[PDB]
Design a protein around this ligand. Sequence first.
Ligand SMILES: [Cl-]
Length: 175
Amino acid sequence: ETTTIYMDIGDKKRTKGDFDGAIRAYKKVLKADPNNVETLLKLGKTYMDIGLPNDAIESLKKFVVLDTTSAEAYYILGSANFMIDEKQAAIDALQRAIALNTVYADAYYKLGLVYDSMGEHDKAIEAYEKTISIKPGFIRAYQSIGLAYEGKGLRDEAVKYFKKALEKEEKKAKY
Ligand SMILES: [Cl-]
């Protein structure tokens, strides 16, 4: 019961943006139920929300030990690593997300962002092209390829991608 009561109190607080309060509630669940993976993930995300990525990483690591086959958890872990410039740690976690779900569009996209940040613009473009192969409406992937091409001085190819991103934006907006 403690687990249900306080998980529900925490979500309510997190939803209202009372992140310190949600943390207290989630901590209370984990007192009784240290292996609660759902709260480990919520706590991790909430730590990310208040700018404490190392604490996020700790909580997400605990999750992934207990449930090793959640692509989402590895995606989030990867994102938290990226926030503290642990770029290879981000890559590794995102590659595990992708291995678990090879059609995980968001993980491919983030992987591209991590490659871009490392100066690895050709692997970034590939990661972005994979993203669009999964979700052809993933606008930010067209935009990021566009900008990768601007970086390469392929300015007409960049404009093709910017126009394609616009086309997708317009189709979206008209529904
Ligand atoms: Cl590269």
